[PDB]
Amino acid sequence: ELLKPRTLADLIRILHELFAGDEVNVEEVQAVLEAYESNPAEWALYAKFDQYRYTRNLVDQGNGKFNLMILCWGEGHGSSIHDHTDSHCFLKLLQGNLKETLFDWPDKKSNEMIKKSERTLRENQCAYINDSIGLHRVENVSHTEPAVSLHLYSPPFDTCHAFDQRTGHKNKVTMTFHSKFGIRTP
């Protein structure tokens, strides 16, 4: 029984129920993430920005089943084209808008990675991606509005790949957390 999360803490409690087992009902997780109405006061603690690039702020460790984190995108900040290390990835906008560009997995032959499609993710919307679907880049293209998104990855992962748009070549990147549970972790 999926009920509307009343607050971010309620959403977290519901996610611990949805990930109590060993599999993941993607449509139910996405529906509950979409149903949480972003309340800035509830997540201000985690919305720690950096002037030069987007930040990853860990919110909950999901009893080991998933990492829930808040990403803070300054104006013009964006990600590399990347995969998700065989994990489910949910991305819910909490403030602002983000452009998501989708790319297919490259072939071994060096080639320009051409976008398959693009879309604008708006406040409160929840997107989903996994490696079977493809790769993506996420960008705050706004010149005037910072964006904040809530991401859930299951299983959690600390490393993934960035892809060079010009060649399709990939490199392993280790991600780091800017803060954990509201505490800056330099």
Contact indicator for 30, 150 with CB cutoff of 8 Å: no
6 burial type by CB count under 10 A (0-12 exposed, 13-18 middle, 19+ buried): middle
Task: Determine if residue 115 is left, alpha or beta; phi over 0 gives left, psi from -120 to 50 gives alpha, anything else beta.
Answer: beta
* 161 is annotated as contributing to ligand binding: no
Is 136 assigned a ligand-binding role in the annotation? yes
Pick from 71, 55, 72, 65: nearest CA to 12: 65
Please give the annotated binding residues for Fe cation, written as ranges.
Answer: 82, 84, 136
Please give the annotated binding residues, written as ranges.
Answer: 82, 84, 136
